[PDB]
């Protein structure tokens, strides 16, 4: 559903700006899907991945057909980063509190196994450092210098 919604907010931010182009409603429930989860078990990041990628290949299994397949092959890697990339295509129209909202879990989700998830995940944290600089040095500052070596790490 988050990369139909996806394609929704591509076409819609490619096409009115050759308001429904300035106000969204969706956007806060992604953002809530992507800090609904367990950076720590039954809804894991890893977990969410690996469930992500089985539908992915059986979906594939299933139309094995040129369009699908292609379309699954370049526009669609994973299922998983579907959300997280979806905001960097609205980014101008998030305010400046959702950076703020989304900025942990993409800081949290950087060291994810899948490159798609890891790209999307610097993408937004450069995004939310150029809009909201504060924020994101604070939260080094405090990350640096944690009482913890992995932390650290």
Same mark, same amino acid.
């Given at each position: 559903?988050?990369?139909?919604?996806?394609?929704?907010?591509?076409?819609?931010?490619?096409?009115?700006?050759?308001?429904?182009?300035?106000?969204?409603?969706?956007?806060?429930?992604?953002?809530?899907?992507?800090?609904?989860?367990?950076?720590?078990?039954?809804?894991?990041?890893?977990?969410?991945?690996?469930?992500?990628?089985? #539908?992915?290949? &059986?979906? +594939?299994?299933?139309?094995?057909? %040129?369009? !699908? *397949?292609?379309?699954?092959?370049?526009?669609?890697?994973?299922?998983?980063?579907?959300?997280?990339?979806?905001?960097?295509?609205?980014?101008?129209?998030?305010?400046?509190?959702?950076?703020?909202?989304?900025?942990?879990?993409?800081?949290?989700?950087?060291?994810?196994?899948?490159?798609?998830?890891?790209?999307?995940?610097?993408?937004?944290? #450069?995004?939310? &450092?150029? +809009?909201?600089?504060?924020?994101? %040095?604070? !939260? *080094?500052?405090?990350?640096?210098?944690?009482?913890?070596?992995?932390?650290?790490?």
């Amino acid at each position: 559903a988050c990369q139909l919604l996806l394609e929704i907010t591509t076409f819609l931010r490619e096409t009115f700006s050759c308001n429904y182009h300035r106000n969204m409603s969706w956007l806060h429930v992604m953002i809530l899907l992507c800090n609904q989860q367990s950076f720590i078990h039954p809804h894991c990041y890893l977990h969410h991945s690996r469930s992500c990628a089985r #539908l992915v290949r &059986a979906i +594939k299994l299933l139309y094995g057909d %040129s369009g !699908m *397949l292609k379309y699954i092959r370049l526009q669609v890697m994973s299922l998983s980063p579907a959300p997280l990339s979806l905001l960097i295509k609205a980014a101008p129209i998030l305010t400046e509190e959702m950076y703020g909202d989304i900025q942990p879990a993409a800081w949290e989700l950087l060291l994810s196994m899948d490159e798609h998830m890891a790209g999307a995940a610097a993408a937004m944290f #450069l995004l939310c &450092a150029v +809009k909201v600089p504060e924020a994101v %040095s604070d !939260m *080094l500052m405090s990350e640096f210098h944690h009482p913890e070596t992995v932390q650290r790490l």
